[PDB]
Amino acid sequence: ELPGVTEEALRLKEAALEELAAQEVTAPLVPLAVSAFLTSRKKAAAAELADWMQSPEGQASSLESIGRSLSRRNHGRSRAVVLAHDHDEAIKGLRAVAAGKQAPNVFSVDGPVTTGPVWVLAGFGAQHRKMGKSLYLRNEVFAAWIEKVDALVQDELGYSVLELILDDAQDYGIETTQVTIFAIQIALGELLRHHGAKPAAVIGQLGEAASAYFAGGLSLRDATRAICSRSHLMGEGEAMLFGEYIRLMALVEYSADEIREVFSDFPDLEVCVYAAPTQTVIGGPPEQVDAILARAEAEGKFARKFATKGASHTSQMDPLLGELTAELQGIKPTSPTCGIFSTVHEGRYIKPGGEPIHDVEYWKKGLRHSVYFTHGIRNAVDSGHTTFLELAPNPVALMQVALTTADAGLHDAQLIPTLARKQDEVSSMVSTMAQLYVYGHDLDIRTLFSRASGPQDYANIPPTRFK
Numbered sequence: 085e086l087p088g089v090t091e092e093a094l095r096l097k098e099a100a101l102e103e104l105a106a107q108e109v110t111a112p113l114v115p116l117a118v119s120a121f122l123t124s125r126k127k128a129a130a131a132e133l134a135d136w137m138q139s140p141e142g143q144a145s146s147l148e149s150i151g152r153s154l155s156r157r158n159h160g161r162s163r164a165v166v167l168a169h170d171h172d173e174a175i176k177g178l179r180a181v182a183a184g185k186q187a188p189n190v191f192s193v194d195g196p197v198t199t200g201p202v203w204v205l206a207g208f209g210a211q212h213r214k215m216g217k218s219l220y221l222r223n224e225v226f227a228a229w230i231e232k233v234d235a236l237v238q239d240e241l242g243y244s245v246l247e248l249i250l251d252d253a254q255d256y257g258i259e260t261t262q263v264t265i266f267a268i269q270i271a272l273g274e275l276l277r278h279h280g281a282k283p284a285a286v287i288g289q290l291g292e293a294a295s296a297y298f299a300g301g302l303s304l305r306d307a308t309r310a311i312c313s314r315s316h317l318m319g320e321g322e323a324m325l326f327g328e329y330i331r332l333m334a335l336v337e338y339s340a341d342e343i344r345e346v347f348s349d350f351p352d353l354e355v356c357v358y359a360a361p362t363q364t365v366i367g368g369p370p371e372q373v374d375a376i377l378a379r380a381e382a383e384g385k386f387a388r389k390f391a392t393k394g395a396s397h398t399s400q401m402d403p404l405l406g407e408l409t410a411e412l413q414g415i416k417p418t419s420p421t422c423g424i425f426s427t428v429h430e431g432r433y434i435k436p437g438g439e440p441i442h443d444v445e446y447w448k449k450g451l452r453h454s455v456y457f458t459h460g461i462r463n464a465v466d467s468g469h470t471t472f473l474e475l476a477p478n479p480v481a482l483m484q485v486a487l488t489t490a491d492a493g494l495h496d497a498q499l500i501p502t503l504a505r506k507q508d509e510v511s512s513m514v515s516t517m518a519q520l521y522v523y524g525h526d527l528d529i530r531t532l533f534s535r536a537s538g539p540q541d542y543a544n545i546p547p548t549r550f551k
């Protein structure tokens with residue numbers, strides 16, 4: 085039997101709910117969908133809806149009742165969604181749709197995307213103090229999954245991740261960043277699944293643990309053992325590092341090919357992550373890291389050091405591997421239920437129903453060796469994928485994805501973020517789900533609105549005109 089929500093987490097929740105209740109209520113973001121077989125007809129429906137919402141009767145109906153009525157039409161091949169806070173934004177967005185013009189709150193396509201979405205599970209550098217807290221208090225599905233992971237992590241490591249999420253005075257270190265982002269990744273994807281969505285394939289960059297869960301390669305319990313074992317070993321190892329044993333990590337604007345020649349001058353550098361066509365994260369002794377940084381800056385290339393005294397995906401991980409091996413005994417790798425672009429295995433693809441991959445050796449190899457991220461993405465583009473959806477508290481890896489997709493010739497990919505610092509977390513997920521609908525991916529747009537309890541919940545337009 086699993087541990088429950090701790091007493092301190094309940095105390096922090098009550099206080100956060102009082103802070104929330106005393107705050108300035110903000111208008112929700114509402115998705116208004118129009119569609120038709122022909123784009124020209126879709127454009128006319130948008131202009132007709134805009135005319136009606138400008139009338140006194142349309143002005144008197146809530147955005148939510150308008151969007152609920154729209155959610156019940158036939159959903160045609162040519163689709164658009166206007167995301168709006170008030171009637172003025174809605175009408176303006178609908179004029180854009182009718183005019184075939186672009187606007188920040190408007191998505192409009194002539195037809196569905198041909199291949200299903202790639203879920204991107206990264207996470208490095210995405211953390212911030214209050215990540216996940218707002219959505220936890222305001223979304224019961226997300227909350228339920230956060231609490232489920234909070235219980236497994238309590239059982240594995242002996243502390244509550246929910247306490248960290250709810251206590252604004254606490255911040256994240258190397259260990260707690262990984263397990264908390266994992267919990268947020270699990271809960272974000274299950275929230276999406278609750279509304280009908282699903283990955284055609286996953287790709288990881290920790291995020292590998294959560295990718296294994298959503299690919300059906302491990303149970304939630306064994307994915308949690310994977311992230312817990314790696315996280316606490318890395319945090320405890322990094323904390324004992326001083327002096328000649330410190331190893332830095334840095335981003336440099338070199339491609340894999342340039343790195344090969346550049347490294348001939350720096351015998352102890354290794355590649356941590358091939359992140360984008362000309363962005364590589366390297367690691368090694370501080371004197372050599374500073375020198376490659378100075379070389380890149382002298383060549384007009386950007387370079388940036390990260391905050392860590394240890395370098396994962398380098399030989400410095402060798403002391404941890406034996407203990408990682410011991411802690412992961414008992415996990416049960418299963419056959420994947422969607423595709424996997426494995427950045428541990430050089431970016432290659434594993435098909436749904438393939439042989440399992442997520443055994444103990446996988447997690448050792450992943451922790452010790454380079455992450456072939458840009459290779460996995462390029463493999464996804466080359467096999468027809470155009471929609472990439474990142475589950476994260478901040479869309480860091482989507483910026484890397486955009487660089488690879490453009491470089492592989494795909495200049496209009498669908499790059500869908502989820503949460504973002506200083507963006508309303510509930511509004512962000514409305515947007516994520518509206519985009520999945522517009523491009524034709526699995527999503528039940530009716531579940532974006534509560535069930536109607538009376539006629540005031542509908543608007544006097546098709547298909548719910550009042551008789």
Ligand SMILES: CS(=O)(=O)Nc1ncn(-c2cc(F)c(COc3ccc(OS(=O)(=O)O)cc3)c(F)c2)n1
Nearest residue numbers: 208209289335357359363365386388396455480484
């Ligand atoms: C104003 S600017 O343009 O100069 N700043 C700027 N530009 C691009 N940036 C950037 C590029 C990146 F590829 C990454 C990802 O970096 C990782 C580092 C370790 C890592 O390790 S792992 O997850 O364990 O595999 C995984 C990923 C990043 F976080 C930032 N930053």
Ligand SMILES: OC[C@H]1O[C@@](CO)(O[C@H]2O[C@H](CO)[C@@H](O)[C@H](O)[C@H]2O)[C@@H](O)[C@@H]1O
Nearest residue numbers: 095096099100102103250251252253254
């Ligand atoms: O929530 C803001 C407000 O609550 C107080 C107690 O009234 O502190 C609570 O919330 C803090 C922020 O998460 C926690 O760190 C603290 O433990 C909790 O009691 C106030 O001090 C704070 O201003």
Ligand SMILES: OC[C@H]1O[C@@](CO)(O[C@H]2O[C@H](CO)[C@@H](O)[C@H](O)[C@H]2O)[C@@H](O)[C@@H]1O
Nearest residue numbers: 159520521523524525526527528529530
């Ligand atoms: O065209 C069907 C296709 O569209 C999606 C959203 O992309 O679902 C929409 O259409 C369904 C009716 O065909 C509705 O049930 C649903 O509410 C609406 O979102 C996909 O899920 C579906 O495959």
